[PDB]
Amino acid sequence: RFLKVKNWETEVVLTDTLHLKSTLETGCTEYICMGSIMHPSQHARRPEDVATKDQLFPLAKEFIDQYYSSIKRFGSKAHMERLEEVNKEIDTTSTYQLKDTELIYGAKHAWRNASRCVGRIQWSKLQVFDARDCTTAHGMFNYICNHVKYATNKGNLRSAITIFPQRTDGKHDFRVWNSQLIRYAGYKQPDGSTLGDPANVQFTEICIQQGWKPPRGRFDVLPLLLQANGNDPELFQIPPELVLEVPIRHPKFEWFKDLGLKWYGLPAVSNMLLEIGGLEFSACPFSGWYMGTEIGVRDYCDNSRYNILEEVAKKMNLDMRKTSSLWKDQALVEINIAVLYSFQSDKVTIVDHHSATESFIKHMENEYRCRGGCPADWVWIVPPMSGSITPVFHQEMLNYRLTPSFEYQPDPWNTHVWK
Amino acid sequence: RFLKVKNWETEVVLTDTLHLKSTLETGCTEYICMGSIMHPDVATKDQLFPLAKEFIDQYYSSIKRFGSKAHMERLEEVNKEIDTTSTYQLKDTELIYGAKHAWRNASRCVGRIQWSKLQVFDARDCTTAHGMFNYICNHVKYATNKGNLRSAITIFPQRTDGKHDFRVWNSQLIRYAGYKQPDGSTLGDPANVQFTEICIQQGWKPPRGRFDVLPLLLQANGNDPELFQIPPELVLEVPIRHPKFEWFKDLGLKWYGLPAVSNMLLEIGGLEFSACPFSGWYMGTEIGVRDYCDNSRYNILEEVAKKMNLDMRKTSSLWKDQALVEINIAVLYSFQSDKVTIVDHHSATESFIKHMENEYRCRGGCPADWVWIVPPMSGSITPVFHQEMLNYRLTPSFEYQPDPWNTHVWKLV
Numbered sequence: 001r002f003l004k005v006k007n008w009e010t011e012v013v014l015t016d017t018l019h020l021k022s023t024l025e026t027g028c029t030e031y032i033c034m035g036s037i038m039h040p041s042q043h044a045r046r047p048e049d050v051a052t053k054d055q056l057f058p059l060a061k062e063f064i065d066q067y068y069s070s071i072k073r074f075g076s077k078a079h080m081e082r083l084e085e086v087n088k089e090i091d092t093t094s095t096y097q098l099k100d101t102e103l104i105y106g107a108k109h110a111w112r113n114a115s116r117c118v119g120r121i122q123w124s125k126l127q128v129f130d131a132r133d134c135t136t137a138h139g140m141f142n143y144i145c146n147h148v149k150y151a152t153n154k155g156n157l158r159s160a161i162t163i164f165p166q167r168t169d170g171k172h173d174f175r176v177w178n179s180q181l182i183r184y185a186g187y188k189q190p191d192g193s194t195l196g197d198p199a200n201v202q203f204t205e206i207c208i209q210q211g212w213k214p215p216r217g218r219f220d221v222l223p224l225l226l227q228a229n230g231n232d233p234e235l236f237q238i239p240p241e242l243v244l245e246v247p248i249r250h251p252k253f254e255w256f257k258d259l260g261l262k263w264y265g266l267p268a269v270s271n272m273l274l275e276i277g278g279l280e281f282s283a284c285p286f287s288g289w290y291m292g293t294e295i296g297v298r299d300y301c302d303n304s305r306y307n308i309l310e311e312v313a314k315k316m317n318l319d320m321r322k323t324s325s326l327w328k329d330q331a332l333v334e335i336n337i338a339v340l341y342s343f344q345s346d347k348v349t350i351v352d353h354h355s356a357t358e359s360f361i362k363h364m365e366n367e368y369r370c371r372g373g374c375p376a377d378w379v380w381i382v383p384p385m386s387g388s389i390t391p392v393f394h395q396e397m398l399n400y401r402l403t404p405s406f407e408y409q410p411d412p413w414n415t416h417v418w419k
Numbered sequence: 420r421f422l423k424v425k426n427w428e429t430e431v432v433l434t435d436t437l438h439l440k441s442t443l444e445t446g447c448t449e450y451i452c453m454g455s456i457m458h459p460d461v462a463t464k465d466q467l468f469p470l471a472k473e474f475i476d477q478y479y480s481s482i483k484r485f486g487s488k489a490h491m492e493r494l495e496e497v498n499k500e501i502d503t504t505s506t507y508q509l510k511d512t513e514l515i516y517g518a519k520h521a522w523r524n525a526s527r528c529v530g531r532i533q534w535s536k537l538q539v540f541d542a543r544d545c546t547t548a549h550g551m552f553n554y555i556c557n558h559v560k561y562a563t564n565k566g567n568l569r570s571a572i573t574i575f576p577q578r579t580d581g582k583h584d585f586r587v588w589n590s591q592l593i594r595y596a597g598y599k600q601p602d603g604s605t606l607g608d609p610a611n612v613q614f615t616e617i618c619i620q621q622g623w624k625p626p627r628g629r630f631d632v633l634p635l636l637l638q639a640n641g642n643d644p645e646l647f648q649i650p651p652e653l654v655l656e657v658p659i660r661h662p663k664f665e666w667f668k669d670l671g672l673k674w675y676g677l678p679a680v681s682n683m684l685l686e687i688g689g690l691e692f693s694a695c696p697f698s699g700w701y702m703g704t705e706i707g708v709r710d711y712c713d714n715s716r717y718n719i720l721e722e723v724a725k726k727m728n729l730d731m732r733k734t735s736s737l738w739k740d741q742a743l744v745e746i747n748i749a750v751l752y753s754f755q756s757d758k759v760t761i762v763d764h765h766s767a768t769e770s771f772i773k774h775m776e777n778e779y780r781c782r783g784g785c786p787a788d789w790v791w792i793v794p795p796m797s798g799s800i801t802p803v804f805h806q807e808m809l810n811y812r813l814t815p816s817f818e819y820q821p822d823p824w825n826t827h828v829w830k831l832v
């Protein structure tokens with residue numbers, strides 16, 4: 001039993017065995033493929049809330065077993081006691097506690113297993129901030145500020161994740177309500193349009209409704225909305241000297257800087273769920289650095305986002321009569337050129353989509369040579385511009401779900417009964 | 420049971436019931452997705468009976484005659500034939516219906532809003548390669564229509580025992596030749612180098628130029644394939660120029676206007692039509708992104724970037740991206756100027772979203788392959804990018820088949 005993937009530029013074939021260790025459903029069947037569904041499956045590893053012992057322990061025994069095999073100590077003295085130790089905690093607390101090394105292993109391996117991440121060649125170079133001692137929203141704000149400041153590192157960005165206490169009964173969850181630590185506000189206008197970032201309108205309204213005083217500009221950094229041990233969330237303002245921002249200019253078009261555009265330097269995903277041996281860390285903000293397309297193809301150019309193509313085209317003097325002039329395509333390129341050139345000018349880490357995609361091909365090779373496989377989601381790996389002129393477009397990929405993992409989770413306002 | 424797909428740009432939600440009617444593999448398992456795998460002797464009497472029943476039932480349902488007197492007589496007729504002859508023959512009505520639906524069911528095709536407007540040429544009376552050449556010439560002339568292209572397919576005799584297959588050995592009816600040089604370089608189209616060697620061996624005397632139309636290699640009834648030169652007056656060609664860069668014409672570039680796919684298999688009710696060339700018209704990016712800029716292809720980015728004085732030292736200047744756009748602008752401007760039918764990728768994807776919605780309304784779903792529907796450039800600024808799509812295999816369908824020089828056992832000398 002194998003499966004081969006082939007790269008149709010280079011004719012390199014790769015033999016995948018790692019997929020035999022797949023645990024969760026992808027959503028597909030032999031009669032239907034769901035590889036372009038956003039959230040295809042709802043196959044979770046334990047039931048919704050406080051699991052019984054025979055539900056939680058088998059997941060724990062798997063993770064510990066996997067960790068001790070990783071370090072060539074399977075069945076060793078330490079491993080056997082660790083099993084017995086996790087049994088006692090589950091028996092007396094209906095949960096258990098990860099060792100500091102187990103916690104680091106798991107975070108790095110959830111990144112490694114993130115089939116959608118084009119960036120995983122860095123997976124083992126992740127800094128882990130243990131914040132499992134935290135108890136309040138103020139403490140969360142302290143931990144998050146240190147995260148942001150370490151990771152920003154004056155622009156030489158560093159990957160980090162900060163791990164808050166795990167879910168216990170489902171009522172005492174820790175949650176960052178922000179989807180990223182640094183996003184811009186979006187404002188519903190009287191004339192029906194949208195000022196700022198339309199993705200965040202709803203979140204911006206919850207902030208205003210929670211007492212935030214909006215500047216009502218186009219690039220207003222949003223407050224943090226931190227929730228600790230299930231209490232009501234609390235607004236904090238990130239100290240601006242911690243929010244690195246790049247003004248976007250263009251190496252050719254001098255008029256570009258007059259579009260009054262900037263973006264933040266640190267992408268810090270903060271609404272996902274980290275799962276390790278059946279433990280669920282509902283607040284695990286992680287951050288690395290941007291691929292240029294993320295800002296310039298999606299953030300600036302989606303219709304339901306900043307939607308700035310029309311403006312950039314006008315200033316370029318393009319025939320916007322019909323689509324066949326390819327005026328969107330042209331403007332779209334000049335933008336991502338401008339974004340790259342600006343980050344590089346301010347010595348802020350950023351990677352282009354040719355470098356990133358090439359990296360990931362190399363990562364694939366490494367993973368197949370040393371691990372027998374590497375899960376990859378072609379729909380998400382291929383950059384959203386210039387797909388076929390990058391090497392991943394011609395790379396076949398197998399997609400399967402390995403644990404530890406990052407998972408989606410409901411937005412907390414759909415589920416939070418206030419006080 | 421139902422399934423939902425969402426458009427994350429518009430928030431439209433469609434409900435797929437049609438997926439229940441599929442019964443072929445996708446290659447995916449319940450624990451592994453093969454969505455990006457490119458490609459994941461003949462049927463006995465027993466295997467053919469149900470296949471034919473499914474198709475006949477579907478046809479008669481389609482014309483609001485299910486369970487009718489004509490329906491049951493046709494079904495009993497098909498049975499007599501499989502009993503007697505171990506195969507059966509489609510009526511003309513069923514052949515048209517089947518060929519139209521295989522296009523409709525082609526999950527990888529973004530042009531399916533046009534599916535019901537398809538001209539079917541019945542060529543099941545054909546017996547020789549000369550016969551095939553005649554049929555293909557009439558296909559090309561009808562489809563090209565002086566630049567106002569019309570979709571058509573020509574269907575040759577179905578498979579029998581596998582020993583008497585009809586095959587077009589060309590992958591398209593009109594492609595340019597490729598020639599490896601002693602110094603390793605390549606003249607013409609690198610994609611076709613192998614097929615070029617085969618033709619040259621079979622006796623074709625090549626011009627050894629950059630845009631030589633390859634000869635047809637036609638196999639009828641399991642015999643050795645035979646060479647024919649498509650009459651040059653039937654090959655409509657477009658010289659590629661750019662509306663702003665006057666230096667572009669000096670690249671010497673041209674393309675053929677008629678995409679005519681000939682290496683595939685058409686399956687209707689268990690019958691396999693191993694030779695079924697079909698044609699429509701181009702999306703610009705097929706020539707412009709893939710045919711010129713793929714590195715295993717004509718590979719003209721560097722030359723275009725040079726003439727643009729682009730900074731080609733570092734990727735992050737995005738010279739490849741910038742050059743690719745201009746080449747695609749030229750392709751579209753060239754065809755539109757010569758009034759040859761073509762569709763740009765924005766128009767194409769827009770129409771496909773419209774077609775998908777209509778198909779969910781009146782048919783209960785529409786199988787689609789995101790990995791193929793999204794254009795190979797500027798993906799996220801076309802609406803299919805944000806459109807969730809279910810993939811499953813309806814039949815009749817088009818199908819891959821092995822290249823005939825891998826399996827043909829030669830006859831002469």
Ligand code: HEM
Nearest residue numbers: 111114116117118119122159161286287288289290291406
């Ligand atoms: C260091 C440079 C990194 C780059 C360039 C990068 C790049 C990307 C990009 C472009 C995406 C697609 C996201 C989108 O388009 O919305 C993605 C997905 C993802 N990345 Fe990475 N990433 C990096 C670091 C990390 C780190 C440190 C982690 C976790 C520790 C991570 C985990 C993930 C996950 C879980 C997803 C899937 C998210 C989802 O399904 O919404 N990445 N990555």
Ligand code: HEM
Nearest residue numbers: 522525527528529530533570572697698699700701702817
């Ligand atoms: C009328 C205009 C049409 C347009 C603009 C169009 C567009 C396209 C494009 C761009 C592709 C991807 C091709 C590739 O990337 O290699 C494709 C695939 C395909 N098309 Fe259409 N098409 C048209 C008509 C037709 C017709 C008339 C048929 C058959 C009757 C057909 C059947 C298919 C099939 C079977 C595929 C998938 C091919 C494969 O699996 O390799 N198309 N189409």
Ligand SMILES: N=C(Nc1cccc(CNCCc2ccc(-c3ccccc3)cc2CN)c1)c1ccco1
Nearest residue numbers: 038039119267268269286287288289290291294408
């Ligand atoms: N470089 C980076 N970037 C990056 C990486 C991972 C994830 C993201 C953000 N990804 C969110 C995309 C998304 C996911 C789920 C839904 C969704 C919402 C509600 C229900 C169901 C699904 C919607 C979206 C919006 N497209 C950015 C980065 C951040 C940290 C390290 O690296």
Ligand SMILES: N=C(Nc1cccc(CNCCc2ccc(-c3ccccc3)cc2CN)c1)c1ccco1
Nearest residue numbers: 457458530678679680697698699700701702705819
């Ligand atoms: N507009 C059109 N275009 C179009 C439509 C359908 C199909 C194609 C050609 N599609 C070829 C892609 C392909 C498929 C399989 C393999 C392959 C090779 C070896 C082993 C297995 C598979 C290689 C390729 C080349 N990429 C073009 C068109 C033609 C007729 C009407 O409309």
Ligand SMILES: C[C@H](O)[C@H](O)[C@H]1CNc2nc(N)[nH]c(=O)c2N1
Nearest residue numbers: 393394395396455456457790791
């Ligand atoms: C490996 C990968 O599936 C392959 O390169 C695919 C991707 N998507 C494609 N999409 C289209 N339209 N045509 C293609 O040839 C391909 N090739």
Ligand SMILES: C[C@H](O)[C@H](O)[C@H]1CNc2nc(N)[nH]c(=O)c2N1
Nearest residue numbers: 036037379380427804805806807
């Ligand atoms: C419908 C489609 O699956 C969805 O819009 C996906 C497509 N691929 C993507 N790829 C990345 N990197 N990010 C995305 O948000 C998406 N969106």
Ligand SMILES: [Zn+2]
Nearest residue numbers: 028033447452
């Ligand atoms: Zn799948």
